[PDB]
Design a protein around this ligand. Structure first.
Ligand SMILES: [Cl-]
Lengths: 348, 13
């Protein structure tokens, strides 16, 4: 029954503060700078998630400035933001008020993995297609997420709508300006990140997305390990030993190191026999040593693996309509505009 | 530990 009011600025629209009221506050998760709360907006009854972020008094918050300019059906929407105190004494925190999505792709993946069952391929196509759309959108701004993983893929299981979240590591990459290499989470780090490269591109998101696809097909992470050595061995066991030309494309400081000598394992034996060959073909074009050889997010959306989604008769397993898949904007298509031939089917 | 939320329709907190 307790109603809380704060003055807050809308995530989008005019920079005009307004009174926002919320109730039914409850802890739902953990964050690096405080717990994450769920709340219910009084004006609309909509559920929101509130997370704390350390406000740097020197620079503008990178996560905030990125989220205020993003508007895409497969990206979590910033509703409001305001400042308050919190966990540490004498500290001012930035509060990000986000549309609440109850589940993640990881929860669905572990649900089938625990039951020793395969996630139905139609859900694999839907989740990965929506993920690549969100990547193509942010990459068109030059923004790299730098922390793609199943736990950061919000999911409404009823409508199968996916939304990318957690832009705390996101950065607009500028060629020629170095970046920290310690971003991205274990299992999902591109090999150039394992090699500590400071000169990398948005293609690290595509490698991480390839790791998500392989995990959804395998029922477990494809490149597990608690250290970079253990992760690299699992990568080499699949892709083979990287050639010196490939190491120079990742981090030329590592060209002369001693790596385990293993020939590549055939892609058709990495996954179970019944895995659809289009899914395997797509993974081989995402998990590539050479970053420029990986598909772009927009190229991945047009891959034959997602042809079933462009069927005019595609239906969800429960029977609902598939979510919005073809409402591409000029910004979203800017990396390859004439790709809308495949991406937008005739019935759209 | 490895989950985003405490709660999920697929498991127990
Ligand atoms: Cl999760």
């Amino acid at each position: 029954s307790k109603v809380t009011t704060v003055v807050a600025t809308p995530g989008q629209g005019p920079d005009r503060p307004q009174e926002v009221s919320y109730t039914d506050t409850k802890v739902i998760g953990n964050g690096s700078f405080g717990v994450v709360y769920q709340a219910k907006l009084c004006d609309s009854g909509e559920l929101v998630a509130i997370k704390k972020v350390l406000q740097d008094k020197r620079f503008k918050n990178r996560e905030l400035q990125i989220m205020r300019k993003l508007d895409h059906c497969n990206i979590v929407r910033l509703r409001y933001f305001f400042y308050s105190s919190g966990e540490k004494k004498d500290e001012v925190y930035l509060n990000l008020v986000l549309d609440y999505v109850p589940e993640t792709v990881y929860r669905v993946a572990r649900h089938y993995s625990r039951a020793k069952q395969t996630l139905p391929v139609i859900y694999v196509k839907l989740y990965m297609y929506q993920l690549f759309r969100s990547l193509a959108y942010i990459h068109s701004f030059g923004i790299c997420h730098r922390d793609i993983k199943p736990q950061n893929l919000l999911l409404d299981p009823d409508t199968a709508v996916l939304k990318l979240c957690d832009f705390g590591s996101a950065k607009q990459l500028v060629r020629g300006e170095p970046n920290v290499s310690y971003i991205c989470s274990r299992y999902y780090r591109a090999p150039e990140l394992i090699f500590g490269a400071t000169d990398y591109t948005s293609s690290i998101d595509v490698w991480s997305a390839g790791c998500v696809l392989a995990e959804l097909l395998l029922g477990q992470p494809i490149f597990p390990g608690d250290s970079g050595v253990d992760q690299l061995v699992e990568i080499i066991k699949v892709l083979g030993t990287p050639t010196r030309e490939q190491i120079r494309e990742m981090n030329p400081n590592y060209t002369e190191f001693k790596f385990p000598q293993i020939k590549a394992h055939p892609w058709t034996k990495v996954f179970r026999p019944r895995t659809p060959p289009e899914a395997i073909a797509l993974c081989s074009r995402l998990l590539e040593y050479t970053p420029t050889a990986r598909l772009t997010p927009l190229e991945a959306c047009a891959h034959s693996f997602f042809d079933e989604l462009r069927d005019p008769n595609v239906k969800l397993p429960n029977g609902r309509d598939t979510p919005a898949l073809f409402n591409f904007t000029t910004q979203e298509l800017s990396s390859n505009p004439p790709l809308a031939t495949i991406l937008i089917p005739p019935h759209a | 530990r490895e989950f985003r939320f405490f709660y999920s329709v697929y498991a127990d907190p």
